[PDB]
Amino acid sequence: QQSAFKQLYTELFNNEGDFSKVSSNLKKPLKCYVKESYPHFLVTDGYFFVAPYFTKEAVNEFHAKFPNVNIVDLTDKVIVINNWSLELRRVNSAEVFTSYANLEARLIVHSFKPNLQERLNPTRYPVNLFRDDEFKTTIQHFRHTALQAAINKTVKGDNLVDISKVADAAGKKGKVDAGIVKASASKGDEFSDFSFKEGNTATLKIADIFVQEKG
Amino acid sequence: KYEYVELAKASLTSAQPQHFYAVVIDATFPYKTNQERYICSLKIVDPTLYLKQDASDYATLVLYAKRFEDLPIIHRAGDIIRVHRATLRLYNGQRQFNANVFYSSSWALFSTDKRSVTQEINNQDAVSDTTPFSFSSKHATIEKNEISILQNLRKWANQYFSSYSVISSDMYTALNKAQAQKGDFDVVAKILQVHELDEYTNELKLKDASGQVFYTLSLKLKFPHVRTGEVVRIRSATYDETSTQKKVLILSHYSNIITFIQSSKLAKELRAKIQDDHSVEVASLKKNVSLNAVVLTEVDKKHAALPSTSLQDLFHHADSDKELQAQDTFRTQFYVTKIEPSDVKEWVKGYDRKTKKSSSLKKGDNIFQVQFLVKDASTQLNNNTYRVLLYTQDGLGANFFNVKADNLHKNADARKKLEDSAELLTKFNSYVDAVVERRNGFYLIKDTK
């Protein structure tokens, strides 16, 4: 490892979504460049881009210590996040591009200040962290681990297909769904037997901060 | 009527629309630049402009359009493109043809090989050796006098690609030097493996003439022609300094992965000279977590050409889909979540051929009766796991473990090797490439180790 975000998000997943177990020397202020502000607010760390999730307090505070400096116009300008936390959430990855395998690591922003001071930095083209090979693989490991535990807890009694069923199958026909086994004690068709406690924390929809600034 | 001119003879003075036939040796993927403009840049050649005196020489073609669909998708180097109404000018010493497809210019792609890339993928025959497999606008017309032009250029294309590298050493960078580059670069390597990372993404395991191995993400929709064992040219890649566990190449929306026509001397030599590497692997088997995928099994040579069938189709559609119903032998990929019976010692049971019954190896004719619980990319998100069997009483999969059946309660050596195999198979990122036979509603592994 170099990408602050990649390291931060990776450590989160490698510690069952527990932000208290992630290295303390990584919970320092985050100086990042704003790649986009609308319709999607995306910031980079010089290697990847992620979507910051602002609390209602975060914007109100910002809108005070920085009057008239609109947030939805921060494009191509740096911001410094002084107070922030990381949560894990279940989402529809087919709808949220800043996620993978229906899982998302969110950067909860409590307080941030703008630095319009001709802030620079020559960087590689920023890419979606949730599209990175290694990170995707990390999230897969995470799921594989949860899936394995659930299966080794749910599946028992060695219910092996009786040998006769497949060793004398000349006059025998069967349905392939006979080979389908439930991996856990789920409710629907999606695997959800995880053990990290899905953090909640209310956040603002990017459009709301646009109306609060230009109805 | 159209008059076709040769690349080197095209007029640089008369900024008038000119037409030509040429061989495509390189091209970006059609990409967007703003809200109404899409661009595709390619390098073209013909009998009058193909070699600097040694590295390859060429002209450049820049096609402009207002819609992604109005531009050519170049999957393979060596095919032929016909262009109508292009203006030629000099750009930094090179002959550059510009064509606005959004106005009056047009293009048509002709296959140099028997079938086009897409036709090879779908196993279709070409309507005729004079039919464009792709073209802009609703129609494309080919005149009788054009036939000789096309047929001759094809012949020339094969001679050219068979006696020259075409994609010369100056057109790409050795993978073991990738990290020394300031920005993007090109690569020429062999695809050692295609790993279905997920529903929309393929992960290519590459290795070029320098011996270095690299991985890169290749979207299924964008590059559906990637095949293991084939040599490709990657247009524009960047070294990923954030990838730690493995060497990764980053591609952009304009990046392109291109194969070579059958006659390619370069592709032929790289296919043979570059041999499969398992080193990047080997090291993993010693780690508690491998970010690198590991394909543990190899299918019998006679099946190497057999197409694969997802778990989704195998277990959810095999009793409804017409095509899957007429087949009893499939090939598929997956990872093992759990192996039953839990006790490795009970993997081998005694079998009574007459009563069709098995028993604990406390007694019988020895056989494997293992039941794998698997899952794959196509079923990654559901709450299921699927049963794949290794019942060898009839010979199917008898040598899967490279351990002949034996009483595992007594043969310590056999029990140990199977225990080790069990840990590898259930380890994250471990996968199995296998052929299965459908019997009475179940799938049995065969011709796999």
Next chain:
DNA sequence: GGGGTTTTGGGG
């Protein structure tokens, strides 16, 4: 001027 189109002569 010339496409495709319908505007079938005439804008920006």
Next chain:
DNA sequence: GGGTTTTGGGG
């Protein structure tokens, strides 16, 4: 044109 969209897992 050897580049950078959003269709934000062809673009």
Next chain:
DNA sequence: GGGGTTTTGGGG
């Protein structure tokens, strides 16, 4: 009519 082009008002 409207694009892209320049034909800058007018063909078929």
